[PDB]
């Protein structure tokens, strides 16, 4: 595999260590990317270096092209957490690191580019399969059988005790990544602090800690550049929109969400999510984890463009 022979080019080192960084512009560097990324944080020497190359080029091709939830969405998330455990380089384990950095570049395998509501409406194998977080088990799924292919398994040079807890630790962030799961997730989160029962000992408290951040990642892409975080929007919308199409094919309204003809309300539209969702995620991890706080505010940065776009300032 050309990823063994494959280095970084310097100029971009200093750039991939900031939150906003952007892989687009370097789509054939990807895989080599996530290489460096689990080199730089866990180290050479983690994983026997021909089966973590297998290994990522064997999840690369179970992301489909779709135009949002596919392999760049994966390595972008991916980024993201790397940014966050170098910046909180003394409270996340060995075994937290490498496992939220394979469970973020998994996190979306096999999208076929259809929301939970989508599958768990028009009786999809998959909805009569998993009746909760529908893609998300899918997701962990398709994890689990790539590790067991020949020559893949990164883990199994490591115990049978300490593998069944990374892979429960994968487990649960894919699973938290289930928007529907986060807002009652983040609410004790925010609960706990309030009352100082914080408690990063306490093993489920970490779990919802780890889910936030995997909530963060997840959405990384509104905290990036404005022109950036601009063009992105336009993926998960005509991701969205393809969805919206099918359901009115079988003379079924979408919600103007999924809706085409409703482009002109985006702008309102992502200001409310910001607002919504976006904004207490990042609030929320940046009081549990003050180094997070660019990501805070480079999405401070997006919601007020979203306002000037409203408003024509
Ligand atoms: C796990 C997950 C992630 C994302 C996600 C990731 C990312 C990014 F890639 F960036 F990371 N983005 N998103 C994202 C995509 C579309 C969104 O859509 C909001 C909206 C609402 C209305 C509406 O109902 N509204 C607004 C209204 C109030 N004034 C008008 C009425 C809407 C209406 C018309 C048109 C468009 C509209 N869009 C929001 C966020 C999305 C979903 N799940
Ligand atoms: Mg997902
Ligand atoms: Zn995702």
Not at 90 to 93: A, D, Q
Not at 197 to 202: K, R
């Given at each position: 595999q050309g990823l063994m022979q494959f280095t970084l080019p310097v100029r971009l080192c200093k750039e991939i260590e900031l939150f906003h960084f952007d892989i687009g512009p370097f789509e054939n560097m990807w895989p080599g990317i996530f290489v460096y990324m689990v080199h730089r944080?866990?180290?050479?020497?983690?994983?026997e270096l021909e089966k973590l190359c297998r290994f990522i080029m064997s999840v690369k091709k179970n992301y489909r092209r779709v135009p949002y939830h596919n392999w760049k969405h994966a390595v972008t998330v991916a980024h993201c957490m790397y940014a966050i455990l170098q910046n909180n380089h003394?409270?996340?384990?060995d075994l937290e690191r490498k496992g939220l950095l394979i469970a973020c570049l998994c996190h979306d395998l096999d999208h076929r580019g259809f929301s939970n509501s989508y599958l768990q409406k028009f009786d999809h194998p998959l909805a009569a399969l998993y009746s909760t977080s529908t893609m998300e088990q899918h997701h962990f799924s398709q994890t689990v059988s790539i590790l067991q292919l020949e020559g893949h398994n990164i883990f199994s040079t490591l115990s049978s005790s300490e593998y069944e807890q990374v892979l429960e630790i994968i487990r649960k962030a894919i699973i938290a990544t289930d928007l529907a799961l986060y807002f009652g997730n983040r609410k004790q989160l925010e609960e706990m602090y309030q009352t100082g029962?914080?408690?990063?000992?306490?093993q489920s408290h970490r779990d919802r800690v780890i889910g936030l951040m995997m909530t963060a990642c997840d959405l990384?892409?509104?905290?990036?550049l404005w022109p950036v975080t601009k063009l992105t929007a336009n993926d998960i919308y005509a991701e969205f929109w393809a969805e919206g199409d099918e359901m009115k094919k079988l003379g079924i309204q979408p919600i103007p969400m999924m809706?085409?003809?409703?482009?002109?309300e985006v702008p309102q539209g992502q200001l409310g999510f910001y607002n919504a969702v976006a904004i207490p995620c990042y609030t929320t991890l940046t009081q549990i984890l003050?180094?997070?706080e660019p990501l805070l505010k480079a999405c401070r940065d997006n919601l007020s463009q979203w306002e000037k776009v409203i408003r024509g300032e």
């Open positions: 944080s866990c180290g050479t020497s983690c994983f003394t409270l996340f384990t029962s914080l408690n990063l000992n306490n990384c892409s509104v905290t990036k809706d085409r003809d409703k482009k002109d003050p180094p997070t």
